[PDB]
Amino acid sequence: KHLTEIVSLMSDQLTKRLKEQDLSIELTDAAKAKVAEEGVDLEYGARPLRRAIQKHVEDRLSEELLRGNIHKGQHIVLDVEDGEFVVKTTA
Amino acid sequence: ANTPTLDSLARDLTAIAKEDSLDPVIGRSKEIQRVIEVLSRRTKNNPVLIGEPGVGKTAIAEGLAQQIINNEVPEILRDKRVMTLDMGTVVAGTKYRGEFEDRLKKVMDEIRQAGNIILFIDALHTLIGAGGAEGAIDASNILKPSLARGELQCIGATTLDEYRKYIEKDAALERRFQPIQVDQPSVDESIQILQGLRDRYEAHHRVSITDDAIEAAVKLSDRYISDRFLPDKAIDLIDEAGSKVRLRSFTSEVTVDDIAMVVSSWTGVPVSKIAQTETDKLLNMENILHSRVIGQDEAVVAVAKAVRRARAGLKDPKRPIGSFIFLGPTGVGKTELARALAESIFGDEESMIRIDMSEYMEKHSTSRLVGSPPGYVGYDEGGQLTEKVRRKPYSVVLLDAIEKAHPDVFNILLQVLEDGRLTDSKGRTVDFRNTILIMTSNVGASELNHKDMKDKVMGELKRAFRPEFINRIDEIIVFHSLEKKHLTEIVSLMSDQLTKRLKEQDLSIELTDAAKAKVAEEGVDLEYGARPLRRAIQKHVEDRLSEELLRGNIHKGQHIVLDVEDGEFVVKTT
Amino acid sequence: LIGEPGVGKTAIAEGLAQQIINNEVPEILRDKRVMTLDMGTVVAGTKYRGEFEDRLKKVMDEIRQAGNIILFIDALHTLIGAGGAEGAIDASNILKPSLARGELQCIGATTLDEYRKYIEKDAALERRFQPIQVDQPSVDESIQILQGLRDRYEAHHRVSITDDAIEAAVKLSDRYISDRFLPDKAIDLIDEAGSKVRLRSFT
Amino acid sequence: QDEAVVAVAKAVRRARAGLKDPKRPIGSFIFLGPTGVGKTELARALAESIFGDEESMIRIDMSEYMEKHSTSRLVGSPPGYVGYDEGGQLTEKVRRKPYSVV
Amino acid sequence: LIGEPGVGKTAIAEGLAQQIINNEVPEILRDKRVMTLDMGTVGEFEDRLKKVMDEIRQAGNIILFIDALHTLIDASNILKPSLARG
Amino acid sequence: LLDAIEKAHPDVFNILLQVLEDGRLTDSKGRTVDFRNTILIMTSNVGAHKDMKDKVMGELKRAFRPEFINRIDEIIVFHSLEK
Ligand SMILES: Nc1ncnc2c1ncn2[C@@H]1O[C@H](COP(=O)(O)OP(=O)(O)O)[C@@H](O)[C@H]1O
Ligand SMILES: Nc1ncnc2c1ncn2[C@@H]1O[C@H](COP(=O)(O)OP(=O)(O)O)[C@@H](O)[C@H]1O
Ligand SMILES: Nc1ncnc2c1ncn2[C@@H]1O[C@H](COP(=O)(O)OP(=O)(O)O)[C@@H](O)[C@H]1O
Ligand SMILES: Nc1ncnc2c1ncn2[C@@H]1O[C@H](COP(=O)(O)OP(=O)(O)O)[C@@H](O)[C@H]1O
Secondary structure, eight states, X not given: OHHHHHHHHHHHHXXXXXXXXXXXXXXXXXXXXXXXXXXXXTTOOSHHHHHHXXXXXXXXXXXXXXXXXXOTTOEEEEEESSSSEEEOOOO | OOOHHHHHHSEEHHHHHHTTOSOOOOSOHHHHHHHHHHHTOSSOOOEEEEEOTTSSHHHHHHHHHHHHHTTOSOSSSSSOEEEEEOHHHHHOOOSSSSHHHHHHHHHHHHHHTOSSEEEEEEOGGGSSOSSSSSSSOOSHHHHXXXXXXXXXXXXXXXXXXXXXXXXXXXXXXXXXXXXXXXXXXXXXXXXXXXXXXXXXXXXXXXXXXXXXXHHHXXXXXXXXXXXXXXXXXXXXXXXXHHHHHHHHHHOOEEOXXXXXXXXXXHHOOOHHHHTTTTTTTTTSHHHHHHHHOOSOHHHHHHHHHHHHHHHTSOOOSSSOSEEEEEESOTTSSHHHHHHHHHHHHTTSOOOEEEEETTTSOSSTTHHHHHOOOTXXXXXXXXXXXXXXXXXXXXXXXXXEOGGGSOHHHHHHXXXXXXXXXXXXXXXXXXXXXXXXXXXXXXXXXXXXXXXXXXXXXXXXXXXXXXXXXXXXXXXXXXXXXXXXXXXXXXXXHHHHHHHHHHHHTSOOXXXXXXXXXXXXXXXXXXXXXXXXXXXXXXHHHHHHHHHHHHHOOSOTTSOEXXXXXXXXXXXXXX | OOBOGGGOHHHHHHHHHHHHHHTOSOSTTSSOEEEEOOSTTXXXXXXSSSSHHHHHHHHHHHHHHSSSEEEEEESGGGSTTTTOSSSOOOHHHHHXXXXXXXXXXXXXXXXXXXXXXXXXXXXXXXXXXXXXXXXXXXXXXXXXXXXXXXXXXHHHHTSOOOHHHHHHHHHHHHHSOTTSXXXXXXXXXXXXXXXXXXXXXXX | OHHHHHHHHHHXXXXXXXXXXXXXXXXXXXXXXOTTSXXXXXXXXXXXXXXXXXXXXXXXXXXXXXXSSGGGGTSOOOTTSTTOSSOOTTHHHHHHOSSOOO | OOOOTTSSHHHHHHHHHXXXXXXXXXXXXXXXXXXXXXXXXOOOHHXXXXXXXXXXXXXXXXXXXXXXXXXXXXXXXXXXXXXXXX | OEEOGGXXXXXXXXXXXXXXXXXXXXXXXXXXXXXXXXXXXXEOOSOOOHHHHHHHHHHHHHHSOHHHHHXXXXXXXXXXOOO
């Protein structure tokens, strides 16, 4: 439970920092549950989770940015529409 | 009640401030107000401006002189003359018993018969040295009795480390002076600084300055110059451009190209690297790579994608740009890729800070990396890697044979991969922000279709060292099978280099691809790395030059072609 | 007056002169002139062979002949090595016999560190000098000091200082200003606050 | 970690109210627990909530002080030994900024 | 000008005076007399040197030259100050 | 002539390596000293015929880096000492 909570918190912090570049971004809660789904408490916590949010969210946005799809001022969400990361880009 | 000597040997900021000859002072409002606040006290009015050389301490003194005449002071400083003085100009002679103390007694006697002098001493860390070192009548031992009773009023201007070193004379010197820390202005602050006085250098040089010009001046002085601060660097570039444009006008507008030109002439990077690649170096960095590097194209495109991802990205600036580990055999191109990217990232690289971790074999060997404790052997400089990066904190670190580290160093490595900026020195925190940390890995050759090698090497990393460690590292760049045709290709490249060198010496050699193939087969074995090929071509060329110059069979200026037509190297000069 | 720097050695000597004028001193000490013999103002204009020790000879002869004169020396540790040259008969040696015989009536003020550095180990002149150490006033003595001194700082900043503020300045300075000493550091707080308040009143 | 957070907050408000013991430090804590639970992120959280840059946090990494003679790096080396003049990697750091989080 | 002895550093100042006589020099530096200093021919040397400084103040077109600048800055007593004033 | 180079250390070794690369050493003032017509001859005992012809390279590539070997002009080896 605290793990999904900290997913929410890390996403909030990430959007906070991305506001430095005037980018408007959102994370669906489904993406948050999927992201936490990789992190497990069996061995240790919150390290794999932070690296996972970083990797998936940020790298995927960079991919859909250098592919030119989005510029600043646009609205973006990373959603899980089919059971896996995908970009809806509400713009 | 006038001052002959003090006016003779110390410039009067107030006088030349009346004539508006003083350049403007922009910003620094909080600092100047604090200076006035300290000057308003009754017993120790003396403030000591502590900063770095070139930050604007004397600028704060000038601004104070300005505000004095411009009815800005709170009437307790109304009509008070600020006089810059330097002890070096005072001493001027030591071979005689009491000349210097006499000059300074005269100066004190003028400060008495006046109330409006507040003597601004630059670099007063040299106020304790004069005469006898620390046991005779130096400058301080005769200033202090006057300084503590408000007899004398002062404005010192030191440097931070000089304050720390020469306030160990605490007892009087510290309490006599209140520090005012002045820090070097930021980018934007400095841009506004320049925009303050562009109409001074414009009027001096009759040249027109643009706003993007000074923006580039500031950006450049930051990126490509170190060991110098602001607004010094900025105004200096601007004035150099003004002078150079004025000259070019004889045998009327400075623009960014001129700023690039002066920074290039200063540091030594060519102008094409500075200006045109400012945001397109990542655009053609893959071109640069695949030029410098031949083979492993999948690895190089992976690296390019990663570095442009981190580059045109939102990644936390704090932590280092790129953490890549190259899995592969040795001689497959590990260093060449590094030097190439660095030459493309930090143009004209000469920057790969190579460290062989196989030399740092054991546990205590890590003290060689960071440095010894204070009370131990070899402590003064030490810090191989730490001092290396402290020198130029803008480069690409390559760490050879990451495997051979005792587990004691992996801790330091992961600390670095944890936001960099590690404090692993004798009290020095080194910053790894624009750098790129790259690690030469273990063999990893046995596993080297694509996915198969991939899962294999991942398991080999699991077994080899921590999974968390690679969870820190960004990318796994795999150096695939050894060269087969890239063999002949790199022979061709090296031989192109050597043919250029031989041509500038008034000769011309053209070795056909058959001889290239023979050199390829000889030089490097299938098991062995591709490094001895350098030696192989060196030996063949030195043999041919030795024989042909010794024998005299060939004549200079006649093109030289080598072939394997007889099964051996045959030289057909004509 | 061996003691730490911000303690008030010079202040003690001045208190002695003030007592001389106020007549509080004993009859034997009544009507004497405290002089502040600086070495910087002594060794100044010589640059020759026989001028520094000449000035000092004349000074000593005046003192001996003049009936009533006390000589206060800031930074006593400068007597040693003063007239440093080829001649190298420094002030410390010209005064030594006269100091011991008792005619030249000195009052030295030094700093404990300067005492141990080069008047204690390097002189063998801590014979002609009685080391009456001076050290930090107590937390309460500092309050009495500063409150007795409050009028001058009022005058200079042209404000009024509430006595609770003086108490608070001393008590705070004691807790965390560790590097300095009283009453110097307490007075520093009062003085900077006076400057800040006057400057606020201005704007 | 409501327990840890409230403990820290109580400490800092004892300090900032006029009640803390003027002799000994603001507060001392030992943060036990598994790897990755956030017991280092609380330190940054605290320095940020109490200061600005959050780099005022004076941090020592006891993974390097294992050789038991490095203790002469916290306090300087003795007098007649190398590195006597610049002594106190920890001591001077704290002497500069006395209101800080070690 | 930094260089080893005999490399022709003063030759550069000489060729500079040459290009000054010609038109290669721009206008701001036009009308500039380059001189030197004879420490021998100049109690009273300070008087003469201060007089020299008066004449420097008179016409601001006298680019002076100094060989062995370190051992010169004596004269520093009024040169280094006069440098600051300009 | 450098004798007992084996007694050197990887730092002075890297120093002399970049020298052998260009001769340009810069010590105590950044003095760009030139190595125009100097000779660099290093002397040591890694040996201590053909089997020796192999062991020499063995202990060279085994005692220090191969790049320093690769800055070869020529390698002079004499094994027999009595005749
Ligand atoms: N706010 C400012 N106003 C005026 N000049 C400035 C300002 N900031 C930087 N400078 C320039 O920086 C240069 C060096 O500053 P200065 O204080 O003389 O360095 P230092 O601190 O070593 O004396 C001066 O030429 C000054 O004109
Ligand atoms: N992909 C490549 N493109 C061009 N040259 C290469 C490539 N791979 C290897 N080389 C050659 O290999 C040599 C580098 O050897 P080195 O980097 O010392 O090997 P290692 O990295 O194993 O120590 C260079 O001369 C370089 O020309
Ligand atoms: N409750 C939490 N709130 C915020 N960040 C947390 C939390 N728990 C863990 N983290 C994150 O996990 C890491 C903290 O683990 P840490 O205490 O450093 O573990 P250890 O020191 O045992 O390796 C940081 O990356 C931090 O941001
Ligand atoms: N570039 C040059 N062209 C012509 N003559 C030169 C040049 N460089 C040096 N010289 C000669 O060097 C001689 C004097 O050198 P000088 O400048 O006095 O050495 P230094 O710089 O050590 O004082 C002169 O005769 C001058 O002609």
